[PDB]
């Protein structure tokens, strides 16, 4: 997260860290959505141009964390993956369209002050909150700078940007399964997700029912916190039928 701040304790209890077993390192961010399901970006697990294709046994999920590097004894929980599920039309060849994946855990994680699931949106939540200007919140343990490493989880609030502005900011082909967020040059304020924040949640707090909903997943960008550039997020609601379908079946 560039130009964000230190998260408060328990401010993002759905925050998940995807951790490589060997070598023991940060792989991505991710989200807790139930006691056995974790949501992330597909590109976190599969991206052939970079020879990335993780299997279950290559990684671990760590839940309840604040500290990036430390083992948080009596606070975090570490879970093993039973099975990975990547969107069958995820487009790693061109623009990361349908950049989304689910992980089922071998055993349920216990909820605590530091561990709690985020809601997923239904049509009305999306209708009402996915508006240009409305701010969401992105969190992660990724780089603090485009060209570093945070001590604790970082957070930053960012406004959703108008679809034509997103489009005009890049040469990449934008789909309806994506949205972009970030401040414009004239807005003075700054912030962005960056390398290692990948797979993490973009959340919004419903002013109707005071609940947090994950509207997006950190997916891609050009540099980090560049002027005139914007972070792009998977549109969670647009892929929810797939999510329902996977969880309903498995």
């Amino acid at each position: 997260i560039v130009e964000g701040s230190d998260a408060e304790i328990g401010m993002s209890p759905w925050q998940v860290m995807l951790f490589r077993k060997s070598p023991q390192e940060l792989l991505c961010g991710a989200s807790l959505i139930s006691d056995r399901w974790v949501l992330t970006a597909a590109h976190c697990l599969l991206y052939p141009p970079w020879d990335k294709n993780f299997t279950e046994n290559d990684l671990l999920v760590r839940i309840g964390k604040h500290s990036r590097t430390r083992y948080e004894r009596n606070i975090e929980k570490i879970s093993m993956l039973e099975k990975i599920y990547i969107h069958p039309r995820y487009n790693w060849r061109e623009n990361l369209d349908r950049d989304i994946a689910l992980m089922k855990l071998k055993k349920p994680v216990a909820f605590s002050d530091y561990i709690h699931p985020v809601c997923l949106p239904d049509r009305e939540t999306a209708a009402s909150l996915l508006q240009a200007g409305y701010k969401g919140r992105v969190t992660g343990w990724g780089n603090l700078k485009e060209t570093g490493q945070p001590s604790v989880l970082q957070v930053v609030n960012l406004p959703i940007v108008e679809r034509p502005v997103c489009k005009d900011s890049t040469r990449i082909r934008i789909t309806d399964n994506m949205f972009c967020a970030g401040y414009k040059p004239d807005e003075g304020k700054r912030g962005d997700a960056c390398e290692g924040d990948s797979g993490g949640p973009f959340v919004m707090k419903s002013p109707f029912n005071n609940r947090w909903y994950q509207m997006g997943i950190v997916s891609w960008g050009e540099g980090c916190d560049r002027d005139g550039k914007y972070g792009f997020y998977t549109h969670v609601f647009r892929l929810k039928k797939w999510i329902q379908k996977v969880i309903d079946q498995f």
Binding site: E8, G10, M11, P13, H116, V118, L120, Q131, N210, R211
Partner: peptide
């Protein structure tokens, strides 16, 4: 059912330091 309600904030009726920035943007 209890999704999205944080034990150390919503469940105790405490607010974090910047959630009002989100609220004020919802319009």
């Amino acid at each position: 059912a209890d999704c999205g309600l944080r034990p150390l904030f919503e469940k105790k009726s405490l607010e974090d330091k910047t959630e009002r920035e989100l609220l004020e943007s919802y319009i």
